[PDB]
Amino acid sequence: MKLAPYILELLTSVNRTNGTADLLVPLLRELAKGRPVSRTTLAGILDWPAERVAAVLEQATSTEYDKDGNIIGYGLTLRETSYVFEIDDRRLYAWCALDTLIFPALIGRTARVSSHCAATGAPVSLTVSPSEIQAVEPAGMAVSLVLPQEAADVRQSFCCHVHFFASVPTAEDWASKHQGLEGLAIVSVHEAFGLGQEFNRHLLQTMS
């Protein structure tokens, strides 16, 4: 289908005043190492005043911290979710299905991704590289999308509704019971990977 509305609202969410657009890729690359990331450390990597890092993270209310106050999650996370994101035999996690498709190009690594169908519990897996997906098991795997909402935190408004499904027909049956979700749509995992590619192209454009 036509995924411009999803691309547009995802970009608007990161490009928002005090949004994550310029901090996102450096933070994901740091989290990809598998250790908590200090705010002070992040400021140095970005060459920002601490003030600027804080205002961004403050707006990003979904950011996850550990007992020491270090960052352990923003899209990519060290805290267990339904979306397993394995890089170089380090098991990390992601906040949603589309995140798993987006991150490999941004961190320059291939990931072994696994989850379960949100409609049936069936195991699903695939290998996601910066340029392509492979080993899609099962081959008809699908993804749900919703429209991000103005000014809303991306995790409760978008991520928690963006799942893998075993197939498009299974996903459409599920979607028929959830039409209250804004802009709910079912796409193949390939279409979703394409959406991620478009998001990334625009993100990497704008990056200073």
Swiss-Prot record:
One of its GO terms (biological process) is response to mercury ion. Its EC number is 4.99.1.2. The keyword Lipid metabolism does not apply. Cleaves the carbon-mercury bond of organomercurials such as phenylmercuric acetate. One product is Hg(2+), which is subsequently detoxified by the mercuric reductase. It is an enzyme of class 4 (lyase). It catalyses: an alkylmercury + H(+) = an alkane + Hg(2+). SUPFAM superfamilies: NosL/MerB-like (SSF160387), Winged helix' DNA-binding domain (SSF46785). The gene is merB. GO terms for molecular function: alkylmercury lyase activity. InterPro entries: MerB, MerB_HTH_dom, MerB_lyase_sf, WH_DNA-bd_sf. Belongs to the MerB family. This is Alkylmercury lyase. Keywords: Lyase, Mercuric resistance, Mercury, Plasmid.
